[PDB]
Design a protein around this ligand. Structure first.
Ligand SMILES: Cc1cccc(O)c1
Ligand SMILES: Cc1cccc(O)c1
Ligand SMILES: Cc1cccc(O)c1
Ligand SMILES: Cc1cccc(O)c1
Ligand SMILES: Cc1cccc(O)c1
Ligand SMILES: Cc1cccc(O)c1
Ligand SMILES: [Cl-]
Ligand SMILES: [Cl-]
Ligand SMILES: [Zn+2]
Ligand SMILES: [Zn+2]
Lengths: 29, 21, 30, 21, 21, 29, 30, 21, 29, 21, 30, 21
């Protein structure tokens, strides 16, 4: 639950920097 | 996935960059 | 919800918060 | 685009949500 | 509270908005 | 302790976006 | 402490860090 | 206000703390 | 692992504000 | 260290400021 | 990686993400 | 400096990495 929603928060910001213009898809359901 | 892979064990930038585009 | 410019990481995060379980796609400048 | 819609301009929830999957 | 409610189980925006004003 | 202080960090930023101008109160003691 | 403009989420967070157990109130533009 | 004090201008700790509960 | 990498994320941002111009060193290995 | 000290137990600003410069 | 200005906390974090186990040093304005 | 290089201007990974330990 939270520990992987608080973690997703960090992931997506980690991927904005890295991916940059290329962009990314953030799903998993 | 990225969650299973990165939350569980620390992912670097190069490991994050696989999830790009 | 804020009536503000949301750029950069503040966007991705707002997307993240706004979409949730669904998820999302960020392309940046198109 | 999101960027041009919600960055260079102000974007609502509904507008911010056009970009969920 | 919000901490007990939101940290323990994932809160949405609509569940966060209860804690407004 | 930390796991609910690191979590509060995310909460308040989640509430700035949502609440917006209306604002919010963030206490609980 | 930084001598900078703190806006938006950078504020709420600085409030959060600066207040602690006490807590706080954010109104935004008054 | 905080916004107008600490956003449109620079704000100290003591100033930033005027807004704790 | 993650719980102290997600925590470091918060720490360094906590130290940017506090330390300000003085700056800080963030290592520990 | 700061990680052992701050992640484990909640550090204040004054406890964070030891790790400055 | 983004081709953007990275300032303030967005820097420290980018440093943090970019350096990792190594770590880093931030001085701010030099 | 980082600030002047990567803030007032745009900074690459390699450039951003000149500041790791
Ligand atoms: C792993 C996961 C779950 C739910 C939504 C997501 O975007 C990602
Ligand atoms: C950058 C980052 C944040 C959170 C988790 C990770 O595995 C990596
Ligand atoms: C947006 C958000 C962050 C952290 C915890 C939550 O329950 C919700
Ligand atoms: C839940 C909680 C504890 C302490 C301070 C706060 O602002 C909120
Ligand atoms: C505690 C720790 C481990 C690895 C790298 C760091 O910068 C800090
Ligand atoms: C401000 C802050 C964030 C995370 C952990 C701490 O101990 C303190
Ligand atoms: Cl900003
Ligand atoms: Cl966290
Ligand atoms: Zn976090
Ligand atoms: Zn910002």
């Amino acid at each position: 639950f939270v520990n992987q929603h608080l973690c997703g928060s960090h992931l997506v910001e980690a991927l904005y920097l890295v991916c940059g213009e290329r962009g990314f898809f953030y799903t998993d359901k | 996935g990225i969650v299973e892979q990165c939350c569980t064990s620390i992912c670097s930038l190069y490991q994050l960059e696989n999830y790009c585009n």
